[PDB]
Amino acid sequence: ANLWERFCNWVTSTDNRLYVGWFGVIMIPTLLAATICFVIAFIAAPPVDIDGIREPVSGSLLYGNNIITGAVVPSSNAIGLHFYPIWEAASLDEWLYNGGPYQLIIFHFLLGASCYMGRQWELSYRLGMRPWICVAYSAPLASAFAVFLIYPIGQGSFSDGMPLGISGTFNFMIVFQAEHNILMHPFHQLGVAGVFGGALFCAMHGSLVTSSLIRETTETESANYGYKFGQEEETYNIVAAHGYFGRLIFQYASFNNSRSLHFFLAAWPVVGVWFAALGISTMAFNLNGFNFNHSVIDAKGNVINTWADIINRANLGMEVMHERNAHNFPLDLA
Amino acid sequence: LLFFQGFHNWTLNPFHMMGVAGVLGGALLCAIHGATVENTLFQDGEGASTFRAFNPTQAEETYSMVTANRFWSQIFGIAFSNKRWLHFFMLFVPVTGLWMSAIGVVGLALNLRSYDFISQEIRAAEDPEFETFYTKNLLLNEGIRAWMAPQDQPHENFVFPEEVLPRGNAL
Amino acid sequence: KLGANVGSAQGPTGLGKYLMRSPTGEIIFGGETMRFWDFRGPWLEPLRGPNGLDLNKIKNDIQPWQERRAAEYMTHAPLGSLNSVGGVATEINSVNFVSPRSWLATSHFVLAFFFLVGHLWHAGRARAAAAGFEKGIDRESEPVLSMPSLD
Amino acid sequence: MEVNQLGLIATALFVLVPSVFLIILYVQTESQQK
C-alpha cells in the first residue's frame, strides 16, 4: 500500500464524518473560496459600477447597507462576458470598482455546487444506495446556473446575472418581468405549480403521516419518542392514512403504495423547478412570455383592454424606469 | 402581484419573505424526502421497476432510515433521525410560512407596509452618489405606479400628461 | 446626418453617447451595447480601423447599404413572445416574428439540459446495476450496518 | 446612517431572551438523572 493508495482510500472513505470524495476534492476548495470571498465582499466591498456607466452601486454593510439591501454587486457591463480574474486587473482597487468579486464568487460557487451534485451520486454509490438524489438536486442547481450563467450569456453580460443579495434578487425579478413578461410564460407557471404544489404535498404528507402515528407514548410526552431510530416497524398506519385520504377525495385519488407516493413527492417539485430553470434559460435567448397586448378589438377597431394589457402597463413602468441612465437609444435590445 | 410590488413594495416585507421561505422550503422538503425514500429503498422484489415490491399492510419500513441518515449526515452535516419529527416538520414549514404571509397581507390591508428603510432615505436624499438595490427598486415601483395607475384605477380618472411620466433616458 | 459630431458627443453619464472605449482602448459603440463590442459583422467591419471604429470612416465612408442593413438588423432583433409577437415584451400586437436564432437556441438548450439529466440518470443507474444494488438495499446485508458509527 | 436608536437593544433582547430560555431548558434537561 503506497501513499497514493491510502490517499485514495481516505478520500473515498465511508467513515469520514463528512464524505470527501473526488468530487469533494474540487467542491471543498471552490466552495471555501466562494464563501470566504462572499462574506468579505458582503461586509466590506466598495461600490461597484454594475452597469458600466461609472455609476457605482454600494452593496456591502460598511458602505451603508443592511441585511435586506446589501449584495455582492454583479461585474461591470463594460466587461460584458469577458473573464475578469484578479490578475487581469491593474489593482485590487480596480478589481473592486469593476465587480470582480462577483465573478470569482459565482464561478467558484457554480463549480462547487456542480461537484456537490456529483458528490451526492458518489456517496450514494459508496453506501450501496440507488443513485438519483443528485438528479433531484439538479433542479435547484439548474436554476442557479440559469440566473448566474445562462441568462448572462444570453444577454451578453454578467452585469445582468442575479445579484448576490436580497434586494438585488428582487431587482433581477422585476427587470426580468419587464423584459420577458415571465409571469405569462408557461414554464414559470409550471415552476409556480411546482413550488406551490410542493408546499401543498409537503404539508399534506406531513399531516397524514402525523395523523396516523401508532400510539406508543403517554399524554405527557412527545409522540416523537414513540419512534426509535433504526426500528424495523413502520411507525404509522399507512392503511388508516390512505383510508382517510381516499374518503377525503375519492378512493382512487389516493396512494396506498408508499413507493409510488414518495416518487410523486420527488417528481412533482423537481419537474416543476426544472421547467422554471428552463424558463429562465430560454428567456435568456429572448423567447418570452405570452403577449396578448391589444389582442381583443371591438367592431370599429377600438382596443378592448384585458388584464394582459394592465400587466403591460406595469411592465412598461418597470421598463422605462430601470437603469435610468444606461440607454441612449429607444430599444432595449439586451 | 405586480400591483403589490409597485404600491406596497411587498417583496421587502419580512412576513412575505417568511412566506417565501415556507413555500420554497416546503417544496425542498417534498422533493428531498421523496427522493431520499426512493433512493434508500430495500430490495423487496426482483423487478427493476421497484414499485411492485411494496405491500400496504406490511409491517416493515420500505426504505432504510439508518442508511438515509448516514448519507445526509455525511453530505449535509445533519440528518433527520426521527421519522415522526421529520413528518411533523413537513407539516410545520409550509403551514407556518403561509400563516406569516397572511400576517403581512393583513398589514397591507391598511397600507401598513414594509415600504422603506428610513436611514437609507435620509442618506440618499442628502447624497446623490449613494445608490443601493433598494433605491433602484423604489425607482422601479414609482414607474409601475405612474404607468399603470390610470388604466388600473379608472374610477380615479387619472390623466397623467406625458411630461410628468417618470422615465429614464431614451426608454 | 442632423449635424452631430458623434466622436465628441458626451452622453449623460459622461461616457460618449455614440462612441466610447472598451476596457482595453478600442473605439466601440456606446450605450448598453458597450457589452457587445466583440461583435463582428460584414456590414460593420468597413468602419473598423486598427484602434477600433474609425471616426473618419464614420464621417465619410458609410454607404447606404450599410444604413439599410443596420436598420434591418436593429428591427429584426432576436426578441419576441412565445406566440410570435415580435419585439420587446411590452410591444403591441402587429409583427409576427420570432428569430430562428431564438427558436434554435432555446430548443437546443432545453434538449441539452434534459439530456444532462438523462446522463445523470443512466450513469448512476449503470453504476448501481453493475455493482448490484440498482433494485434496492439488501435487508440481510445492509452495508451501512457494517460501518462504524459516524460519531 | 440615521438608524432607529432602539434597534440595537431591540435586536439584542430579541436574540437574548428567547435563547436564554432555550438554554435554561436544555441545561436542566441534561442535569436530570439518566
Partner: peptide, 30 residues
C-alpha cells in the same frame, strides 16, 4: 453598530452550524 450587529448574528449562526454538526447528539440504533 448596525454592521457589528449583522455580523455578530451571522457569526453566531455559523458557530451554531459547527456545534449542530460536530457536537450533535449522535444517532443510535436500538
Amino acid at each position: 453598530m448596525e454592521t457589528i450587529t449583522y455580523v455578530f448574528i451571522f457569526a453566531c449562526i455559523i458557530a451554531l452550524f459547527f456545534f449542530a454538526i460536530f457536537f450533535r447528539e449522535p444517532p443510535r440504533i436500538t
